[PDB]
Amino acid sequence: MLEKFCNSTFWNSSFLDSPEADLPLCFEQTVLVWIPLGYLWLLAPWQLLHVYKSRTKRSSTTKLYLAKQVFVGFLLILAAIELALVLTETVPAVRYTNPSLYLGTWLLVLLIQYSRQWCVQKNSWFLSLFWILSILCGTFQFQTLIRTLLQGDNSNLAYSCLFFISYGFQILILIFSAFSENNESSNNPSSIASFLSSITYSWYDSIILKGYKRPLTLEDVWEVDEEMKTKTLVSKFETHMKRELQKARRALQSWLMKALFKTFYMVLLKSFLLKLVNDIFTFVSPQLLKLLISFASDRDTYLWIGYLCAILLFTAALIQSFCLQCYFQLCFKLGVKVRTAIMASVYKKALTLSNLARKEYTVGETVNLMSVDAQKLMDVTNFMHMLWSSVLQIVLSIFFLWRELGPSVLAGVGVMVLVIPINAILSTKSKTIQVKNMKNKDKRLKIMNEILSGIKILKYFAWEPSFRDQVQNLRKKELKNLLAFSQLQCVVIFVFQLTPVLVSVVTFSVYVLVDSNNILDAQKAFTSITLFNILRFPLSMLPMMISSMLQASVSTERLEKYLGGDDLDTSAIRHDCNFDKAMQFSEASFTWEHDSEATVRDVNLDIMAGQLVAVIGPVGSGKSSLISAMLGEMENVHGHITIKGTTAYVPQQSWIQNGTIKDNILFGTEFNEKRYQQVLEACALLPDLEMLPGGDLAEIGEKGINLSGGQKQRISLARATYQNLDIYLLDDPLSAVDAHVGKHIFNKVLGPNGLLKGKTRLLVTHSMHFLPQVDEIVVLGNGTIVEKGSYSALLAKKGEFAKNLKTFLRHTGKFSIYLEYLQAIGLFSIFFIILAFVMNSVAFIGSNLWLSAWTSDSKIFNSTDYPASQRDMRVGVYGALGLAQGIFVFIAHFWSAFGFVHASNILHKQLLNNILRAPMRFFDTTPTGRIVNRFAGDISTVDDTLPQSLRSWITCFLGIISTLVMICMATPVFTIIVIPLGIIYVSVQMFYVSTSRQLRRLDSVTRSPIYSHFSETVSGLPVIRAFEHQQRFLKHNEVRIDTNQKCVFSWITSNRWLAIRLELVGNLTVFFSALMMVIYRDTLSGDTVGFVLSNALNITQTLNWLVRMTSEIETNIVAVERITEYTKVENEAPWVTDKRPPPDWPSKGKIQFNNYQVRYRPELDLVLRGITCDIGSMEKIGVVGRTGAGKSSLTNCLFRILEAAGGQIIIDGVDIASIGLHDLREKLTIIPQDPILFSGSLRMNLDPFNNYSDEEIWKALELAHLKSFVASLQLGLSHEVTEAGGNLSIGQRQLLCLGRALLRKSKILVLDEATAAVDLETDNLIQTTIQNEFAHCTVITIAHRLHTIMDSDKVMVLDNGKIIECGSPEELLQIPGPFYFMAKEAGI
């Protein structure tokens, strides 16, 4: 075809037959120079016009640009000399043509390198992929010329000496091409990096070298680009969301996935051509060791075939680690981009949803549209390409298997398919025992809150074991659903790890039995064993996949129902800037529901600007409905409302955001010190701020849990007053505040002399005191304005207002942590679940090492001389090594389950049995948030997530030490290569683990603020739309998502810089081993090559999962650090001591204090400073003093809650310090200031130990006056108590506590303000019962009510930790001491 073109033979096929093969020199200069040049010249126009359009300011010429230009200049000089030496010196066309095309091209390249100067990415994929294409194409000529020269045929040294230097530049320009850091454009180097630095993710080394030294912060992670930010995603999505939704409503007389495929169809198609290439390049290696096995079988083949399959087996496995990791970033970027156009598009819809179509949603569930329905669409697009990629890796891996083992392989496939039913029935039954366990996961935590919230009371009585066994007995019913759950995940893996071992036994055992003439070779047994690994995963995830898109089809149905909802109608409310009146009602009627009668009927009302107006009426008259209509919340039946100026709104239920007091009051407005202080004093908030430790900066909890109801209302009012709007709408703002405060607020804020004098004010109030100062009063009756007028006018009319007014008036006259878990499992049980794993790695090396000794038969016997006597010891002994792994992978996976739900049983058990024995100081110091997390989020990992991670590390680590024992026993010289690779792998261990942990703990840290914020804007939505501040919240939810993307996307590309360096170590091992099966081809059998290479081909998958399961064992093993720090905290004195007192002790109830001293903490000053007193038998004593004088402190000393710093306490002649704590506590009784009641039945709260009969309990209740109330209950003593007794009145709880005291009948009783929060009638009942029933017991009373103490035999005055006076009440009253002054101040 081209013979005359070169004048030499073109493609003499015999050139590729001799032991010294070489391509014809004409072919190299005829087809290996047009592939590269053809690639460029055919494609330069696209990459030159495309850059002119996207023009940018020229960058400063850096050194690398000039150098890249000089060298391309040389290729012009060297491409011109070549032509010169031809014209100057009969030559063929090829001798002067190809030289010219270099000059023509090198100019074009010299220009394209100049054009990139006006682009962000200097070294694009175009010219950085033409050097590769011209170095792997111009290297077949760097050998033909060099081989020719070495034979003394230096008759072409002119053309050769040029090519040997021109080719030395293409491999030097490429090196300069990879480097691209020539600016700081883009805060992230992701967009300035070159091609060879964007496919290997080598621009990510800066983050890793930064997080390895320090702890990463949100600033060390660069922001995402502009094409990925939220304000841009919600822009592209919007134009498609509405169009499909628009036509979706057309057919009404499913739209979300049409508006999500259209928005991203340049990433579904861009990453569809990389999963398709990855599938083409995944069956190359399985079909490329079929030659290294045949090659090693024969010692006659040529060496050049040996090294050409050891290079294409490393160059075709290097392109598949880039076409893949460059595909995993296109799929994992479309997930964080499909949950950001749905997160940021649900928020934007929360602010414009008709409240008629919002009451059907609950704030607890509308928030879940961002937490489970928008993250179930993030996890479906991450692997949405396995719908066709797992049907193409199956249709192919079954075809390539068929070509080798024929129809017999259907038996092999028939086994894997029969695992799909087992992988879908043990996954369903796994969810059942998981969700079924959520009941005991929650109700277990519910109780723990009660124990911690009220531990002080729990320690007063001997109720510790009562509650210690309540949780323990409540946990055994959870482990049984855990031990039975860890056995359903160690059987779904055991059937996945043993799948390739069972198919290999069935397939061969049927190939060599179903028919004679079938003999195994190394080209059938070892190239099909590595074909059962390509088909293992695609065929063992379909049940898990198609059950995860059908689960995401019920979530897209929710968003499709929320986003495509109705919109609030504001047509009724008109806004006119020229309107004379501030507000006006023109026959306006509003109804909450279209099917419900209007709550506001034909209201005609006109309001002038600046007027203070009050609306009054009976409860349920529609007052709150009127204010709702003003905001546009209520639906219009007929009429309209005209409004002029901005509107402020104060809800009856005050809505407080999460943040500081200063933040809520400002509400996004600039801070003005002068105005801000004026509002606080006007709002009477200064006293409130002073009490708070942080003042105006004090952080507000969820829904103002730290603030009182009256407080919240003032803050809500302060917010409106500060904002300074034209119209004010108030909904009973003074109901929750005191009368005097209301007067101050009204006079300084709402009244004619207040701050809002010049602004229109509407005040819906139930208080009739402010009406005389109101400009106009409106009376609402049955949804209609019954009467309207000024205060004096209404009184004269003698209407309903006067009638109601008269009615109102008539009523007014590290490795330690890794051991603590490991020891808990039982070191004995750890020897048998690591010996049974290593014995599986010894039946694996034996199972394949036996197959290499089986395929050797083909080289000895044949189809004729292969007896059944010898053909059965092979298929038999292989069927015994195929179940010798099935009784060590099953004996090591069950015994592991029993060892991981027993270490959890003995970690919670110790923790719960230690904090319950901790000194009171420990509980007060640490917040309840911590102690309740060591049972919520920590014991929830030691149970479920840590067991599954330590099991996949032992099975992985032994999966690589076994594969390094096969690769090494064949060629021992390979051992010296592992050391260079081990350092590379160990160095990647340190860098990835250090930085991957810090980035997925910066993901959860800022994953909730998206949701926590979403609760605020949806619960307090009506307030936001009132101020028109619904546009500073979109920008506040497009900034709480952009702060997550920067942390989620910075972790997605941290498993890419890894997967490319661990698929370059397990891929550099299938090379440095396949390249020693050719050097030593004279000693290695054909069988041994498959025995070694068929394993090394899957050392890249196993190396990744040993470095990712080494990262979860470092992020989850933190849990065991906290569960152990608390378990080893200091404890109180032993509950029971050898020196038990007599059973009747105490007999007289005498108490003696001897210079007693106590301090709350070692670092805090003494609370009591030498207390010395004697209390006689049956002596009634009252304790009085100023707050903080140590009154309540004395009680703690009696119960030994606070250990003595000095002195001693003796009861009935025995020092309490020598007695066990419980023995002392069971014989003392205290009625607490706060009557805390735990959840459960009344019987349990009264007698948790169940040591008493119902009759005694009923008798105690009768003495407590609670018999009637308890009898009235349907369940009686079995009546359930809510948390903290929220269903019982404060007096009822206190009476119930009295029931506890009357039951115990202790000789010593202590009353600590038992009647501070008790009404007089119940207080007298308590006193009467105490006086009668406890007349024969020593009673010590602490009370702020002196009259309750005048009956005491003696009264002690405590001040600053010292007893000043001690005597009878009469004697003290005669002496003008502190007691006299307090009694005088009390009116006595």
Ligand X SMILES: CC(C)CCC[C@@H](C)[C@H]1CC[C@H]2[C@@H]3CC=C4C[C@@H](O)CC[C@]4(C)[C@H]3CC[C@]12C
> Minimum distance from CB of 1063 to ligand FEI (Å)?
10
Query: Whose Cβ is closer to ligand FEI: residue 505's or residue 956's?
Result: 956
Nearer to ligand X, 632 or 959 (CB): 959
C-alpha span between 546 and 387 (Å, rounded): 8
CB of 266 or CB of 550, closer to ligand FEI: 550
Give the CA dihedral 132, 138, 139, 145, nearest 10 degrees: -160
- Name the one residue in this structure whose structure tokens are 């099966």: 1077
The full DSSP string for 977-1022 is HHHHHHHHHHHHHHHHHHHHHHHHHHHHTTTHHHHHHHHHHHHTHH
Indicate whether 1110 belongs to the interface with ligand FEI (CB under 6 A): no
What Å distances lie between residue 162 and 74, 77, 86, 96, 175, CA to CA? 11, 11, 13, 14, 20
Q: Which residues belong to the annotated binding site for ATP?
A: 617-624, 1185-1192
Q: What's the CA gap between 1343 and 1310, in Å, rounded?
A: 11
Interface pick for ligand FEI out of 94, 216, 386, 907 (rule CB under 6 A): 386
Q: Where are the beta strands (DSSP E) in 1178-1299?
A: 1180-1185, 1206-1211, 1214-1215, 1228-1231, 1240-1241, 1280-1281
Show me where the chain is broken: residue before each gap, C-N > 2.5 A.
89, 253, 813
Minimum distance, C-beta of residue 497 to ligand X, in the bound complex (Å): 5
Smaller CB separation from ligand FEI, 202 or 790 = 202
Q: Which amino acid is at 1085?
A: S
d(CA 1356, CA 1363): 7
Specify the residue, 493 or 954, whose C-beta has the smaller distance to ligand FEI. Answer: 493
Residue 1069 tokens read as 């091992």
Near ligand FEI by CB under 6 A: residue from 449, 472, 926, 1101: 1101
Query: Rounded to whole angstroms, what are the CA distances from 57 to 117, 152, 1133?
Result: 9, 55, 78
By beta-carbon proximity to ligand X, the closer residue of 206 and 497 is: 497
Rounded to whole angstroms, the Cα distance separating 1023 from 1019 reads 9
Site string for ligand X, 1070-1109 (x = CB under 6 A): --------------------------------x--x----
Residue 139 touches ligand X, criterion: CB under 6 A? no
CB 1299 within 8 A of CB 1242: no
Q: Decide if residue 783 touches ligand X (CB under 6 A).
A: no
> Is residue 204 a contact point for ligand FEI (CB under 6 A)?
no
Separation CA 437–CA 485 (nearest Å): 10
Residue closer to ligand X (CB basis): 182 or 1102? 1102
User: What is the smallest separation between the CB atom of 393 and ligand X, expressed in angstroms?
Assistant: 16
Q: Pick the stretch among 405-413, 541-549, 980-988, 1037-1045 that binds ligand FEI (CB under 6 A).
A: 541-549
Residue closest to ligand FEI when measured from CB atoms: 544
Identify residues 945-964 at the interface with ligand X (CB under 6 A): 952, 955-956, 959
In angstroms, rounded to a whole number, what is the distance separating the alpha carbons of residues 941 and 1119? 7
Task: Kindly state whether residue 383 participates in binding ligand FEI, applying the rule CB under 6 A.
Answer: yes
Out of ligand FEI, ligand X, none, which partner does residue 959 contact, by CB within 5 to 8 A per kind?
ligand X
Given ligand X, ligand FEI, none, residue 398, with its beta carbon under 5 to 8 Å by kind, binds none
Of the candidate spans 539-547, 597-605, 971-979, 1089-1097, the one that interacts with ligand FEI by CB under 6 A turns out to be 539-547
CB of 51 to ligand X, least distance (A): 43
- The 1264-1293 contact track toward ligand FEI, x by CB under 6 A, reads ------------------------------
Position 491 contacts ligand FEI (CB under 6 A): no
- Residue 756 is which amino acid? L
Question: If contact means CB under 5 to 8 A according to the sort of partner, which of ligand X, ligand FEI, none does residue 541 touch?
Answer: ligand FEI
> By C-alpha distance, which of 1135, 1154, 1138, 1134 is closest to 1211?
1154
DSSP, collapsed to helix, strand or coil, labels residue 603 as: strand
1235 binds, among ligand FEI, ligand X, none (CB under 5 to 8 A by kind): none
Give me the least distance between CB of 279 and ligand FEI, in Å please: 8
Estimate to the nearest angstrom the gap between the alpha carbon of 484 and the chain centroid: 27
Site for ligand FEI in 858-877 (CB under 6 A): none
By the rule CB under 6 A, 537 interacts with ligand FEI = yes
CA angle, corner 1163, sides to 1160 and 1167, nearest 5?
35
Spatial contact of 1150 and 1338, defined as CB atoms under 8 Å apart: yes
**Cβ distance 1171 to 1259 under 8 Å?**
no
Is 544 one of the binding residues for ligand FEI (CB under 6 A)? yes
Q: Tokens 């009625």 map to which residue?
A: 1231
Q: Kindly state the number of chain residues that form the binding site for ligand FEI, as judged by CB under 6 A.
A: 13
Under rule CB under 6 A, residue 992 binds ligand FEI: no
By C-beta, is 483 or 493 nearer to ligand X? 493
Residue pair 137/32 in contact (Cβ under 8 Å)? The answer is: yes
φ and ψ of 712, to 5 deg: -50, -45
Residue 956 contact among ligand FEI, ligand X, none, beta carbon within 5 to 8 Å by kind: ligand X
d(CA 1287, CA 580): 53
317, HSE (Cβ side, Cα atoms, 13 Å): 29
Residue with tokens 């607890």: 364
**In terms of CB distance, is 322 or 953 closer to ligand X?**
953
Q: Which of 167, 272, 496, 953 binds ligand FEI (CB under 6 A)?
A: 496
Cα distances from 753 to residues 612, 767, 838, 1032, in angstroms, run 11, 19, 87, 33
Binding mask 1041-1080 for ligand FEI (x = CB under 6 A): --------------x---x---------------------
CB nearer to ligand FEI: give 463 or 1105: 1105
Interactions with ligand FEI, residue window 318-357 (CB under 6 A): 328
Q: Which residues partner with 1230 through β-bridges?
A: 1310
Helices (H) and strands (E) in the chain, counts: 68, 24
Q: Is the peptide bond preceding residue 1146 cis, with omega within 30 degrees of 0?
A: yes
Q: Which is nearer to ligand FEI, 852 or 996 (CB)?
A: 996
Q: Decide which of ligand FEI, ligand X, none touches 101; Cβ closer than 5 to 8 Å per partner kind.
A: none
Give CA 534 to chain center in angstroms: 33
User: Which residues in the 492-531 window bind ligand X by CB under 6 A?
Assistant: 493, 497
Interaction partner, residue 107 (ligand X, ligand FEI, none; CB < 5-8 Å by kind): none
Rounded Cα distance, 1235 and 1165, in Å: 30
Pick what 544 binds: ligand X, ligand FEI, none; C-beta below 5 to 8 Å, kind-dependent. ligand FEI
Identify which of residues 463 and 496 has a Cβ nearer to ligand FEI in the complex.
Answer: 496
Q: Which of 548, 586, 646, 804 binds ligand FEI (CB under 6 A)?
A: 548
545 contributes a contact to ligand FEI by CB under 6 A: yes
Strand segments, DSSP code E, in 617-661 are: 635-643, 647-650, 659-660
Query: Which is closer to ligand X, CB of 952 or CB of 1192?
Result: 952
Report the residue number, 537 or 676, with the smaller CB distance to ligand FEI.
Answer: 537
CB of 378 to ligand FEI, least distance (A): 12
Chosen from ligand FEI, ligand X, none, partner binding at 272 (C-beta under 5 to 8 Å by type): none
Please report whether residue 541 would count as binding ligand FEI according to CB under 6 A: yes
Residue 1301: which of ligand FEI, ligand X, none does it interact with, CB under 5 to 8 A by kind? none
**Residues binding ligand X (CB under 6 A):** 493, 497, 952, 955-956, 959, 1102, 1105
**Residues binding ligand FEI (CB under 6 A):** 328, 383, 386, 493, 496, 537, 541, 544-545, 548, 1055, 1059, 1101
